[PDB]
DNA sequence: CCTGCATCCGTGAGTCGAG
DNA sequence: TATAATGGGAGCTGTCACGGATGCAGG
């Protein structure tokens, strides 16, 4: 099982009062508390790429190929869209209910917050790990030990 | 006990890579491949077995196996790797021979 | 543990002749 | 020098009596 380290940048917009203000967010730590269901709307137009994790997900919006948007969906927010779907500015991408928090897999290193109206658009720098399994036949052998860090191009088996 | 396929493959691999490592150490130190092989084997088997080999150009006493072992250990790290490779190669060889001994019985029972 | 009896193991079992 | 093969096989049976050592239950 190779856990691949990935660090990206994704925005999330929330009601201003509901947000619990913190410099950074530990995995599982409460991101906010909602008095009432809040739909998280699309701020850009394009096709949707939904990348789902063990818990929580990523919405990558794009026109042509190059991504025009990257949104992060934390725990407690149920996605309202499918993969490969057309969305326009203002239509709900997902639905957040009650208390929402960070996934146990991913951690937010730094948070850039912006005041706009009654909301705040958080720019998250997120770090997580995506696992990939490799089946080993009896005729092969593992050249790497337990918990050993490998870079790109390095031989495992 | 009898080997599982993975163990068979593993031992064979260790043996082959061990021989390759011996050729490598021969290319490095400049000694006889047979000499190096018999020194590695001497260290793997134990202190119990050291005996003059008809093939070697020199008498192999523990004194000489220690001289050669000391000339092998004093090599640079990346070169010293092949020593360990060869050692585990010989151990794997012993284990491999000892593992398949039943086959010899079942073959010789027909003769 | 020291003595005594039960048990196992090895050792023997005529000479010469003829085949 | 390359499918894979992975713990044997016959046994000799109806003598007899000894010395010495070895072992076990009993006083």
UniProtKB/Swiss-Prot annotation, chain A:
It comes from the Bacteria. Signal peptide: none annotated. Belongs to the RNA polymerase beta' chain family. DNA-dependent RNA polymerase catalyzes the transcription of DNA into RNA using the four ribonucleoside triphosphates as substrates. The RNAP catalytic core consists of 2 alpha, 1 beta, 1 beta' and 1 omega subunit. When a sigma factor is associated with the core the holoenzyme is formed, which can initiate transcription. This is DNA-directed RNA polymerase subunit beta'. It comes from Thermus thermophilus (strain ATCC 27634 / DSM 579 / HB8). The gene is rpoC.
From Swiss-Prot, chain B:
Disulfide bonds: none annotated. Residues 1-22 are annotated as: Sigma-70 factor domain-1. It is found in: Cytoplasm. Contains 4 domains, connected by flexible linkers. In the active conformation, the domains are in an extended conformation, each making extensive interactions with the RNA polymerase catalytic core. Sigma factors are initiation factors that promote the attachment of RNA polymerase to specific initiation sites and are then released. This sigma factor is the primary sigma factor during exponential growth. Belongs to the sigma-70 factor family. RpoD/SigA subfamily. Interacts transiently with the RNA polymerase catalytic core formed by RpoA, RpoB, RpoC and RpoZ (2 alpha, 1 beta, 1 beta' and 1 omega subunit) to form the RNA polymerase holoenzyme that can initiate transcription. This is RNA polymerase sigma factor SigA. It comes from Thermus thermophilus (strain ATCC BAA-163 / DSM 7039 / HB27). The chain holds residues 92 to 202 of 423 of the full protein.
